[PDB]
Ligand binder design. Structure first.
Ligand SMILES: [Zn+2]
Ligand SMILES: [Zn+2]
Ligand SMILES: [Zn+2]
Ligand SMILES: [Zn+2]
Length: 111
DNA sequence: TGGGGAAGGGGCCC
DNA sequence: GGGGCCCCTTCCCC
């Protein structure tokens, strides 16, 4: 547990404090060597490296389809069985993604 | 109404 | 012991 001096906000993880402080500044030190695109976080750069490399480490356990990104894999999982897994309690409406539920819970104003 | 992309925080392990 | 590498979330916009 560490507290950010700039924002007085608790951040979990001893080594994660430099990452949060970088979010206040807008610096993007990590730069891809191929497309010369800068990213704020290293793990974001590695995902961009997957796009350049074309590797798909996420393989479906039901049909064997290979996808490059985790959310792409989860989208394929919803095609198999998980289509529309979110519901609105107030109005009884189904949704595909969790952000759409947040959009509905704010824009629709059922409550 | 749906999806791609990006921006953040957290857990595990070294 | 700062950090890679994975996970998760909501937001912006077409
Ligand atoms: Zn801060
Ligand atoms: Zn690149
Ligand atoms: Zn599949
Ligand atoms: Zn509703």
């Amino acid at each position: 547990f560490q507290k950010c001096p700039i924002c007085e906000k608790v951040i979990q993880g001893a080594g994660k404090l430099p990452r949060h402080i970088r979010t206040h500044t807008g610096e993007k030190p990590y730069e891809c060597n191929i497309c010369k695109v800068r990213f704020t976080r290293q793990d974001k750069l590695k995902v961009h490296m997957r796009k350049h490399t074309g590797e798909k480490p996420y393989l479906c356990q039901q049909c064997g389809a290979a996808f490059a990104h985790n959310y792409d894999l989860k989208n394929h999982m919803r095609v198999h069985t998980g289509l529309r897994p979110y519901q609105c309690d107030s109005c009884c409406k189904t949704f595909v993604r969790s952000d759409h539920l947040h959009r509905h819970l704010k824009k629709d104003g059922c409550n």
